[PDB]
Design an enzyme around this catalytic site. Structure first.
Site, short mmCIF file in Angstrom:
data_model
loop_
_atom_site.label_atom_id
_atom_site.label_comp_id
_atom_site.label_asym_id
_atom_site.label_seq_id
_atom_site.Cartn_x
_atom_site.Cartn_y
_atom_site.Cartn_z
CG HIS A 1 -2.42 -4.49 -11.88
ND1 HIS A 1 -1.96 -4.74 -11.18
CD2 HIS A 1 -3.30 -2.94 -11.92
CE1 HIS A 1 -1.79 -3.33 -10.19
NE2 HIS A 1 -2.35 -2.70 -10.79
CG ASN B 1 0.26 0.12 -8.02
OD1 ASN B 1 -0.05 -1.55 -7.68
ND2 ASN B 1 0.35 0.33 -8.51
#
Ligand code: HEM
Ligand SMILES: [Cl-]
Ligand SMILES: [Cl-]
Lengths: 500, 500, 500, 500
Positions: free
Chosen positions: C55, C128
């Protein structure tokens, strides 16, 4: 102590149990979901940073400096601008060769590092308890590190490594004489002088340059330990100098130094018979007498040693308007090597650490880096030139040009100046008989088991400095100057410029 | 020495001058284009890595281990598979509380860390010169670090910090008694035993588990220094143990230990009256006698201390088939804390360092990291499962399940076992009168200037262990057990589970 | 902009010239004594820290959360204690596989990381834009990193590496279906939902446990980009999501989410027919309907991206009283892996960084570490237990025990639960015809040039999930299910548990 | 692929299960004693090192260089000593402003970095795909970094930041013209030239100096992408240049360059009408024609991108006898800044990395540092001077002195040379009408939304260079030169030396 504290995580979550780990039954295996243990132990193994590559063992204190005399005709430096003006300081004292745990009361140079929190920047005067040093070119500094520290295989000090190096540098005899004298072991940091050692520069409001040397003279008096007295203190206390200094400040017995300067007009540097930028040489006080400037005292023990003393970063490059550098080849390397050493040891953002932080306006446009805490100059434009009046240079502080003669080249220092011995010979002849016998005894003890050809080489160099010095040293080593002289023909360093 | 070497840069370019820096004229300023100086000094200030958070001071040697007895019925471990089988080892000995420079001959535990280069992986037996430790839950390990090291403000050892902590842990009296005995200062690393201290496991070819303790017994004999003898050695040599061990190996006088094991069948752990996974307790030799396994000698000084000794990384997690862990709560934390400590101290790629590297096949698929040198597993697919027979698990080495009873929770160790004193009482009654007087004298010296309420607390705990122990300690402190007892009512730690 | 600034060094010394370097004559070589250049360039090459291992590409904003509903019967968490109570938050959105510079509008999961600055600690909900994930055991997470990132030799994404891995994990089909659906490319962070994905726990004031799932539902509406629309946006803007979010907040168009929870009493976890801690599975809303809690908006762009967004550290382990973990095997690894990742990436002292710092009392006794700025807990005693009321544990927050059944072992997840396809089959049958055709097209495009045996394997797995899904995928790949079926006999992964 | 591998730990212990973590029962919590998971995940979060502060996005290849012509009368460099002599090379190509993930096909300079593994050291020729650069003093390099990268708050490229900076540096118009021409986007690394850009020096066996410029001319032909063609490639592939170069080498289609030099006798530097060390200026080929030297091809893709390409460290300071530096003020800073950048990014021991390692004898006496692997110069004495023939300097390689005229000072470059426009005016008049229209279109697109006063400033500077250039640019921006001229009176940068 005092106000009750309740244990939390770094994120401020209460810690339920600080005595028991979380287990699958009372005598079962440890669970990964013991968050406090993970955090407590993960942080624990990251507490240690690298020690200083040099001067790792030290003691620190906060204090103040007061101007007592006017020298504004020589320097526009703002901390000196008026009689009575007070500046806050931090000082770290150190040994040189000891690692973090090493004894305080070893035969070594002591560091005398001063940070002045000035209205036009922090001024670091990164000094020693000696006006000179072993070397006059920075080429040799990493070699001195290895010579005075541990052999790569025995992991011990080596008289052979140390004295092979020293005796192949005749320019080193001045500092060798000082560190082998009674003053090689001061009775703690309060009973030693400090020095900038290097020639620096002053610049006055007229944009005139002077060359300058700083002397910091102890108001508690020079006081030393013999080898035997030091050994006895080490047997009880490896932290003898920390004990001494901390205890003194804690009982209100604040140590004081007076600051003086030798001032030399720029043009005098080409008129003196000694190399005026040679770190192995002083300026005789008869040519350039001490001019009094001010007085400083250390009066406050830091609350936290790691935060204020271990993370303290000094840099000779931390200069202010009216105080600048010289072409001393050793000073010239230190102008970059300390800032670089600190980027590695305490991080690129080390100026966030309170002891290092400036106490005046700061606008560097330094961006990012690990552990940025302080705003990072927010959203301000981050380039110059800009159309937005950000990061404007300050030309009023420009120094006069510095005259250069000669091509860029590797200029052999031994061709330029080779007066190795006149200054140590002067110092030997100042000593009384006890101090001389100390110099001889201390020297023979330090050479210990060094190979014989090395002892012969030191005796030769010492005889050249003064026949009585060569004799006293040869005798205390149980050798003769004649054998020293006979050994030169087969000296294994034959072919080598520092071998006389 | 021997073959002449010609100085180059890291990139192999010849260095023209190693004595003079490049300057703008002979007495001019230093030039940035002096490439060798930039390189030499930039590398110089990055030589130092963090010291170990614990056991920073140490000495290392290479050696071999030979199996002398058959224990293959208990363990399938490949290094033990046959009588006569030789395995190469590295051992690092250490103190615990000293930093890099600290004296070798302090009153402290000694580390006894062993790396066995086995055909099925490196096995690290990360031991101490004592069968037990002060603590039985890892919660307390960072606290022990602070207690036995430097006060955050005085930067010195603190008897108050150290003994406040110790006296509030009655389980600690066993190791306190050992380190305050004559064996708290071994006469160098060759005259001390080693121990795994923790209960480990063996797994045999039948997939049966045994609980196991390792004893490494010195073939040079237990030999110690009194406080006074140690102090006299420190006055000359802070590196006394390095001197001793290096010198011994250099003259072919190789030190030897014999390795034994105590073996306990899995089910016996629920049948013994002592907590069998409690690091403050041994297994009595009358219940589990020593079984002989082999012999190791240290016979080779490393060529380079930094590369082989300072960068050495041991991890209790470095286990091999047939040797595994136990639910000892302290062992359980060490199973992760060492690998983590080493990632910070010597880097994620520290297994490239030769002393750490395995001497058997290695296929970890560890990728990248700073300073990757060794191929980085080249172009091989870097994920599993794959269709390419890369990184296949090895189920034949699976251990039998470990029975658990009880919920996941913070289980109070003090509810589970609170026999603090029976083992130290046994040890006190083994001592002869001299050893007892040493224990009392050493204890009163170590408590030095600790606050009185703390001295009273130790005397109470020691009296509870054995009235004669409380008396001898109280007397050597110039106090009485009666005053110790009277002080409990106002003890400032009132409200606290380790305060009896 | 606005107030004129005058350039200084870090130490606050005025900079004379920011346009010209200091040289030996106008066209001469550069001097080492150019202090500002040394500082400016030495700091410059230390601005970059490691990107996140996962990420790395992201956008951040500050905002607030308001409680709208009462759930205090389920949780004692202080931020939820009253209707109307406002908590300040930081949120970082991200892609997963992109490095720092990578396009925003790729087909990928998006990160939805929330930090709540609570009166009893920072609570990180590290979520998420999907309720599930590809994996259910952390063993496979590093493998997923390699599979979805760059081949070790081509340094490019590899459909072969990515789909070999995915097709050998039948449990992954649920998340594969989600990321290959139209929702695999949200039209920026404002048009996607967030999820905790894992089962967490609530603990109420009665010390009762509930299992819980967090849903964060976008008040701006689900909105997506096709492959073609995304490609066209990337051609103009690799920073499309930063542009979108920054621009929205800058014009006062603040994005809002509503927070809901699914609540399951502890005992229900042994009564449900689906594994309730399996990250590849949701809880059906018909069994556990959404209960409304509150609403959050993002309303402030950070002043400095590096200080607030790049240095932001979230950890699933950052929990508060009344919100805790579950035995979800994936969650269990994240409980330690994030705090460890952050110690490396932003430093052990990363909680000094303002975005990470708690906004409540903090007493961790964390000492030292590189870049310590904040006092370092000064001179307070640094160990526990102590006689000085420092670092006292807080037992009132203790959780009820967690029931365990079974031995410690490697328990085969495939024996425990092997319902790979019922949930993806449900999701496929929710889709309308366009969404189905998108799922087929997106899938065949993503598999691109993957080896044929891998395409055959995905078609087999998809057919098993639902014959229409296998057909649509096989067709869009230009293959047949019959060939897929015929290829299983020679599939090179034969012998492998995820190969059905 | 191919030989089956069995998963081990770093220490070589077999891994039992790589699919399941170790848990307290099948649906229970994770255990700390799961050693493989701890190791696998702890190493995983330490794979990433800092990207390069500049030129972060890149592609690498190995290859060879062959001498085709004799230039030994000008240079004693050993790699050039004979026709036919082959030297192995590594080359990294890059963009400048992109981070690790950024698109390959942006409008930017490209890097052309060459490492030659020579018998007298690695020679790094760290070049660009342009003979000049935007700047002529290193003061401005960090500012260029910020201007061409992300705004500290929007975290996006800023036409305002970029063009404010560029338009306030009239010397920059030469490189601005090149990067806004059709050659600002080469069709991959194989269709661009390389240049040393700086003036370097040659030294022949007679100890004579020449000034020299390196040109590397593509044998595949100059080939470019328009803005639209680039955008279309980016929409499919952010790695277009890696794809192109890797694919070419993989199919045996090895790219070739020819190397030429411009040679200028030392004394000519004071006779030319252009500043011969000014990085914003070329040497006209009519004055100093190209002399052919050799040819290189790239013929081998590295096995591992991270080990060989990401860890590759080039330094302009990596010079060999017969090739040296010049007083170009930009080159002079790079002589120290790269070695320093690499100490931070790949470690002090980065010369252990195979791509960086010399392929000739190396004797630096560099000691210790994190991750020392290679012997650490064992037990050899570690200081010089020594009595043991270790680390002997090599004076035969000494360069002739370099003549200096003028004092050390900050010498205003604008006083010394202010011919900003003659070279860009020449380049504009070489262009055909299409290339001119491209230059105008590309310029107006790049200025995008920059504030109007900045567009006016570029138009003024461009008109001064050539009235037709100012017109074409003003027109493509939809402005007039008259308005540009009228805006100068109120230009907010008034008072600023680069504002004409
Ligand atoms: C949870 C309890 C413990 C923790 C957290 C702990 C942690 C540590 C750490 C962080 C180091 C430095 C590691 C490195 O940087 O390589 C260390 C070193 C050491 N520890 Fe411990 N330790 C614990 C208990 C013990 C016990 C019970 C013994 C003996 C049985 C022991 C023996 C050693 C030895 C011998 C070293 C030095 C290893 C070497 O020579 O490199 N420790 N410990
Ligand atoms: Cl660094
Ligand atoms: Cl780390």
């Amino acid at each position: 102590k005092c106000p009750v504290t309740h244990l939390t995580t770094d994120a401020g979550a209460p810690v339920v149990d600080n005595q028991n780990s979380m287990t699958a039954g009372a005598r079962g295996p440890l669970l990964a979901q013991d968050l406090w243990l993970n955090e407590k132990l993960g942080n624990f193994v990251r507490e240690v940073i690298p020690e200083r590559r040099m001067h790792a063992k030290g003691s620190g204190a906060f204090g103040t400096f007061t101007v007592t005399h006017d020298i504004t005709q020589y320097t526009r430096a703002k901390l000196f601008s008026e009689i009575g003006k007070k500046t806050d300081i931090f000082v770290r004292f150190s040994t040189v060769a000891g690692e973090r745990g090493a004894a305080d009361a070893e035969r070594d140079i002591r560091g005398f590092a001063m940070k002045f929190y000035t209205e036009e920047g922090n001024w670091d005067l990164v000094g020693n308890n000696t006006p000179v040093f072993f070397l006059r070119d920075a080429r040799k500094f990493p070699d001195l590190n290895k010579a005075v520290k541990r052999d790569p295989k025995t992991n011990k000090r080596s008289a052979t490594n140390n004295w092979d190096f020293w005796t192949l540098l005749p320019e080193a005899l001045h500092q060798v004489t000082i560190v082998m004298s009674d003053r090689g072991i001061p009775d703690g940091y309060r009973h030693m002088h400090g020095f900038g050692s290097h020639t620096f520069s002053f610049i006055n409001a007229n944009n005139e340059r002077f060359w300058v040397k700083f002397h910091m003279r102890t108001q508690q008096g020079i006081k030393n330990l013999t080898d035997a007295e030091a050994e006895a203190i080490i047997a009880k206390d490896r932290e003898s100098s920390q004990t001494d200094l901390f205890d003194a400040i804690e009982r209100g017995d604040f140590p004081k130094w007076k600051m003086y300067v030798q001032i030399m007009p720029e043009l005098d540097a080409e008129k003196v018979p000694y190399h005026p930028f040679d770190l192995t040489k002083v300026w005789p006080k008869g040519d350039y007498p001490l001019i009094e400037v001010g007085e400083f005292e250390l009066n406050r023990n830091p609350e936290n040693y790691f935060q204020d003393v271990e993370q303290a970063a000094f840099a000779p490059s931390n200069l202010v308007p009216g105080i600048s550098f010289s072409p001393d080849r050793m000073l010239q390397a230190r102008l970059f090597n300390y800032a670089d050493a600190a980027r590695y040891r305490v991080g690129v953002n080390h100026y966030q650490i309170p002891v290092n932080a400036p106490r005046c306006p700061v606008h560097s446009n330094r961006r990012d880096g690990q552990g940025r805490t302080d705003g990072n100059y927010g959203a301000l434009p981050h380039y110059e030139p800009n159309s937005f009046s950000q990061w404007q240079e300050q030309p009023q502080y420009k120094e006069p040009p510095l005259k250069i003669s000669g091509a860029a080249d590797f200029w052999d220092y031994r061709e330029d100046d080779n007066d190795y011995f006149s200054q140590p010979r002067a110092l030997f002849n100042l000593m009384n008989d006890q101090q001389k016998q100390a110099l001889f005894d201390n020297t023979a003890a330090a050479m210990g088991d060094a190979l014989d050809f090395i002892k012969y080489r030191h005796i030769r160099n010492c005889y050249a400095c003064d026949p009585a010095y060569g004799e006293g040293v040869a005798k205390a080593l149980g050798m003769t100057v004649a054998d020293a002289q006979a050994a030169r023909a087969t000296d294994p360093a034959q072919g080598n410029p520092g071998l006389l």
